[PDB]
UniProtKB/TrEMBL annotation, chain A:
It comes from Trypanosoma brucei brucei (strain 927/4 GUTat10.1). One of its GO terms (cellular component) is kinetoplast. It comes from the Eukaryota. This is Uncharacterized protein.
Automatic annotation (TrEMBL), chain B:
This is Uncharacterized protein. UTP binds at residues 123, 162, 196, 200, 227, 276. GO terms for cellular component: cytoplasm; mitochondrial small ribosomal subunit. It comes from the Eukaryota. It comes from Trypanosoma brucei brucei (strain 927/4 GUTat10.1).
TrEMBL record, chain C:
This is Uncharacterized protein. It comes from Trypanosoma brucei equiperdum.
TrEMBL record, chain E:
This is Uncharacterized protein.
Length: 157, 356, 99, 239, 132
RNA sequence: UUUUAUUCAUAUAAUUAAUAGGAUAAUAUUUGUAGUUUUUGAUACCAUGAUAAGGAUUAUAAAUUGAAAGUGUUAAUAUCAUAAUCAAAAUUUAUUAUUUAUAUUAAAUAUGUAUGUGUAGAUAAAAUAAGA
């Protein structure tokens, strides 16, 4: 149990496995927590049907239920620790320490690129790359283009 | 390199190495694999079927006019997949009162079969009175050859199975190939209930006879209930029967026997609660079922567990430890020459070196 | 070493300075004073005893009226809020530590 | 607390340790069944003769043939040692197993004038009967090697057909315990790291595993083992 | 001997183990002796389960359910404030077990879940199984 | 007798072994699959790879808008293939390139102390869509 049989060179690699549980619990409890927070914090009348003291009591009951929810995952995602699944190296998202698409640390990504383990295409180290969105505005412009492709193209009936 | 093995699927090195396909090639299909059409497999789900009838069917094919006529009475009797709560004695009285009025053998037999089925479902104690009242005078008094339809036989067998009655044997004997020949028409659930009832009866002879009849009539040996099979095989105290079961286990499938072992173990352990009647203690058959399942399952390889006490060769033992094997090998050679003709007989051989 | 804005990996590096009189409410507290108190002020289930109240709990009148001992975690092993007062009402415990 | 038989030594007594999982070729871990109860010539050790196995003939088939003989179905008796032969199988001609090799080489007339009956052709089906099916099975192997089409073997034999206890081969199924070191013919080395390992041969044999196994009888096994338990010289976690 | 656990108990029934011992069992070649979570005693299992959820569950001393009256830290032991004293200034809003479970119709919206527990309660008898 | 700049901020706390399929499928309660206990390198050691620093020189004249960034080694460091007693949640703990005078705290808790005539010594950087 305690370094008798582990079968792995790095024991910290189980932190990724237990963080997957955090993500699963977030997927479970995101809707309930969001609805409870919206109902509790909303001050204007909910609808024509319910107003005034009924709404106030409903808000207090909802926040009481939300507080009684023991184990409900309510944690900002940036507070979650990011560690690569291969070498247990920790990286901060938003810096060069972490690679978002591969979801591995900078050390692991560099090792896999120097070896034949990832299919990437080398470009100039001090440029913008092949992508036209990157060359025409940068990270924020590609961010906006991704948003436009994902959401801001549908009619949304 | 490293304790973590490389992934051969997404690694460009292995993907584009000499032993795989480079990316500067036509990238066409390597070979048109066809497995399912060359050799398909049957659908075998580990989970049981959720839409099966989970019971015994009676094939209530009553004439429509008589069904309309007896519908007020038939509402109490079970319909398709519906079991009303009407007590068995009430429908028994209704049938024994209104039977002469119907005046048609087919519908009378169908109604009596429904009554027997309802009594079996309610586990009513007294129902053989109706069978005695409407069976001897037509079917089995002494030599009557009138064959009953395949509803009364099913209902009576199911009632015997539910109530642990002893009258199942007469109809089972009369249903053989020589007589009514209704055995091929029987269902897997019918066989399972019969096996369970005879197992919780102490009738090893009956269990053996039913197993032989099923083997001859091509009954589903792998679709019968595992608990029912365990109950039937528990009562094998007789030697000849026990030997028959020993040679009979080979008919069942590997999965069937492997799960029969688990069913027997669970019933003799935690399964006493789920068993309606506690299972009678029979260690020999349980051990033989476990042994048969272990024999028929594929064998693994445990080198330490098999050769834990493997003594080394005498040569190595004499080389390493100071043992008498050095002269014992010479004595063995002398014994071999004595057994053969190379060495004269009636010649004594004493010790050669000092015993230490 | 630089890290994304308002996403410093250190969580306790925040040094709550001396409370500022002009605001005293829009600083280290809830953005709106019509919001409910956080969960730390309440009891969720049947516990066997709290070791020490967290620093995110807001201070209320019942803290000084009930008289029960309250303590938080700081640089030393523990810090108990001895001699309760009424001046610190509506403020969280992190604003009264000076780490 | 620790023993020579419980540690993970690589080689003991000047021989490769047979208890370690890494001292064995992985081909020995592959699934296999116990065929010790099927037939004498269906055993794994006779795999070199498995490609010459003949089709079976049963007692009911033999009785049917006896009641209704067929014009071109030859029933050949392979029982040698006629001192041990006492009864005549119906519609049967005697062809000794020792002379079958030369009988198939002989021509039609050379077979006729030497064995008293005409040689059955390849297209004609021939049923071979012996004491226990061993000699008849070897004869069937000879016939199939001589490319006869239908060569069936009656494995029930004279013992089943007449209630006789005669044995044609008297082969002892139980194999004598191994004496001597591991045969170097069974030593395998990996083709990359040049590490020598062991194979299931010699002292560590699948025949030895099939024998010395739990008997089908609970009373017999309980009498075989002491009252304490089946295995007690091993640790608690090794049983 | 440096044994992690001093005691252990079997799981198979006493009626079936005594007969199944005569049939050899194929153990794992690289680890024949297996000591799983079921073989632990009741007290050992309770301690291990309590320690398991140290981050979010009652595993942390200050989180609750610690059943310990004093905590030793920084070479200075500190006593525990009981629930009766705590509830004087912490108004209790406990609902009970009826709060953690959500209705069945909310399973789809909660991604196949009903209980709002610290641990994910699987509905299959193979993940959260302990012997039974 | 050539040009440019330099006040830089967190840092340790305790336990990591298994496979198990569900509606429209010719039927498996296998619904609900139940045999403790002979092993041990990193809660603290793997020494080996990358990186830092970092240079080379032929293009006559006409045409063309063209025909134009390349690294050993020495070093330090480290999370990888190699040598058992222990860092990652309870963070004070000091870790180089910062907003200077018309208007300055509203949504996850988001900085009250160095105005002083911009005044040393050392250190780094570039001939690159700029204009020595």
């Amino acid at each position: 149990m305690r370094h008798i049989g582990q079968d792995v060179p790095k024991r910290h690699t189980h932190f990724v496995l237990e963080s997957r549980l955090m993500y699963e619990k977030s997927f479970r409890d995101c809707w309930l927590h969001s609805v409870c927070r919206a109902i509790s914090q909303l001050d204007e009348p909910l609808s024509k049907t319910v107003v005034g003291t009924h709404q106030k009591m409903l808000q207090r009951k909802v926040t009481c239920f939300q507080y009684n929810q023991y184990g409900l995952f309510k944690t900002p995602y940036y507070r979650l620790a990011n560690v690569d699944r291969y070498h247990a190296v920790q990286g901060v998202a938003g810096t060069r320490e972490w690679v978002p698409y591969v979801n591995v640390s900078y050390w692991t990504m560099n090792k896999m690129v120097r070896g034949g383990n990832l299919l990437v295409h080398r470009v100039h180290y001090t440029g913008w790359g092949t992508d036209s969105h990157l060359k025409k505005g940068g990270w924020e412009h590609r961010w906006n283009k991704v948003l436009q492709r994902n959401v801001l193209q549908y009619s949304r009936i | 390199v490293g304790y973590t093995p490389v992934n051969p699927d997404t690694s460009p090195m292995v993907a584009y190495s000499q032993y795989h396909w480079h990316y500067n090639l036509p990238q066409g299909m390597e070979r048109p694999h066809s497995v399912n059409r060359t050799f398909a497999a049957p659908f075998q789900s580990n989970h049981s079927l959720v839409n099966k009838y989970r019971g015994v069917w009676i094939e209530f094919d009553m004439h429509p006019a008589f069904s309309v006529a007896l519908e007020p009475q038939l509402r109490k009797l079970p319909r398709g997949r519906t079991l009303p709560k009407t007590p068995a004695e009430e429908v028994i009285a209704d049938y024994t009162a209104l039977a002469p009025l119907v005046d048609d053998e087919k519908t009378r037999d169908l109604w009596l079969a429904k009554v027997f089925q309802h009594c079996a479902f309610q586990r009513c104690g007294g129902a053989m009175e109706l069978w005695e009242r409407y069976c001897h005078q037509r079917f089995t008094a002494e030599g009557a050859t009138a064959k009953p339809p395949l509803s009364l036989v099913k209902s009576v067998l199911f009632y015997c199975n539910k109530t642990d009655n002893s009258g199942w044997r007469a109809l089972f004997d009369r249903c053989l190939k020589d007589g009514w020949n209704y055995t091929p028409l029987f269902d897997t659930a019918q066989w399972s209930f019969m096996l369970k009832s005879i197992g919780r009866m102490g009738d090893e002879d009956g269990v053996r006879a039913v197993l032989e009849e099923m083997l001859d009539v091509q009954a589903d040996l792998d679709r019968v209930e595992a608990r029912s099979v365990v109950i039937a095989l528990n009562a094998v105290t007789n030697a000849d029967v026990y030997e028959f079961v020993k040679k009979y286990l080979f008919n069942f499938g590997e999965r069937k026997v492997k799960f029969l072992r688990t069913t027997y173990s669970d019933l003799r352990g935690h399964g006493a609660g789920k068993l309606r009647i506690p299972l009678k203690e029979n260690d020999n058959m349980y051990y033989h079922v476990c042994w048969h399942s272990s024999i028929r399952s594929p064998r693994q390889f445990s080198p330490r567990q098999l050769y834990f006490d493997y003594t080394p060769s005498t040569l190595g033992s004499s080389s390493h430890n100071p043992n008498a094997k050095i002269d014992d090998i010479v004595k063995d050679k002398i014994e071999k020459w004595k057994a053969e003709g190379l060495l004269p007989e009636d010649y004594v051989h004493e010790d050669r070196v000092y015993d230490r | 070493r630089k890290y994304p804005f308002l996403r410093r990996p250190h969580i306790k590096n925040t040094h709550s300075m001396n409370p500022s009189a002009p605001y005293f409410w829009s600083f280290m507290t809830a953005k709106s004073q019509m919001a409910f108190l956080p969960e730390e002020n309440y009891i969720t289930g049947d516990w066997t005893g709290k070791f020490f109240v967290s620093k995110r709990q807001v201070y209320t009148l019942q803290h000084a009226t009930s008289g029960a001992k309250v303590r938080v975690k700081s640089f030393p092993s523990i810090f108990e809020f001895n001699s309760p007062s009424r001046w610190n009402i509506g403020k969280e415990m992190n604003t009264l530590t000076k780490p | 607390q620790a023993d020579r038989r419980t540690r993970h030594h690589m080689m003991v007594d000047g021989q490769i340790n047979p208890r370690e999982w890494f001292n064995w070729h992985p081909k020995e871990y592959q699934p296999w069944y116990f065929d010790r109860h099927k037939f004498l010539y269906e055993q794994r050790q006779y795999a070199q003769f498995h490609h010459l196995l003949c089709h079976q003939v049963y007692l009911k088939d033999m009785l049917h043939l006896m009641r209704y003989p067929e014009p071109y179905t030859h029933i050949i008796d392979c029982r040698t040692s006629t001192q041990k032969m006492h009864r005549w199988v119906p519609h049967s001609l005697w062809l000794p197993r020792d002379e079958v090799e030369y009988a198939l080489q002989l021509s039609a007339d050379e077979f006729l004038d030497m064995y008293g009956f005409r040689k059955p052709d390849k297209s004609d089906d021939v049923i071979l009967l012996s004491h226990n099916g061993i000699y008849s099975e070897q004869a069937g192997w000879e016939w199939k090697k001589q490319f006869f089409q239908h060569v069936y073997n009656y494995r029930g034999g004279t013992n089943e057909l007449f209630g006789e206890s005669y044995s044609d081969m008297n082969v002892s199924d139980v194999l004598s315990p191994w004496k001597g070191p591991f045969p170097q013919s069974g030593v395998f080395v990996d083709k990359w790291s040049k590490r020598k390992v062991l194979t299931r041969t010699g002292p560590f044999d699948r025949q030895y595993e099939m024998q010395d196994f739990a008997l089908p009888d609970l009373e017999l096994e309980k009498a075989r083992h002491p009252e304490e338990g089946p295995r007690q010289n091993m640790p608690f976690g090794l049983q | 001997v440096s044994g992690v656990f001093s005691k252990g108990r079997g799981i198979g029934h006493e009626a079936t183990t005594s007969i199944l011992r005569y049939i050899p069992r194929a153990r794992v070649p690289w680890q024949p002796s297996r000591f799983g979570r079921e073989n632990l005693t009741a007290a050992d299992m309770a301690r291990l389960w309590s320690r398991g959820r140290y981050r979010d569950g009652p595993g942390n001393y200050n989180s609750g359910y610690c059943t310990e009256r004093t905590h030793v830290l920084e070479e200075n032991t500190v006593s525990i404030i009981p629930r009766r004293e705590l509830e004087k200034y912490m108004p209790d809003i406990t609902i009970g077990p009826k709060a953690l479970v959500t209705p069945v119709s909310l399973m789809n919206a909660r991604n196949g879940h009903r209980v709002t527990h610290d641990l994910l309660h699987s509905y299959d008898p193979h993940i959260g199984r302990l012997g039974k």
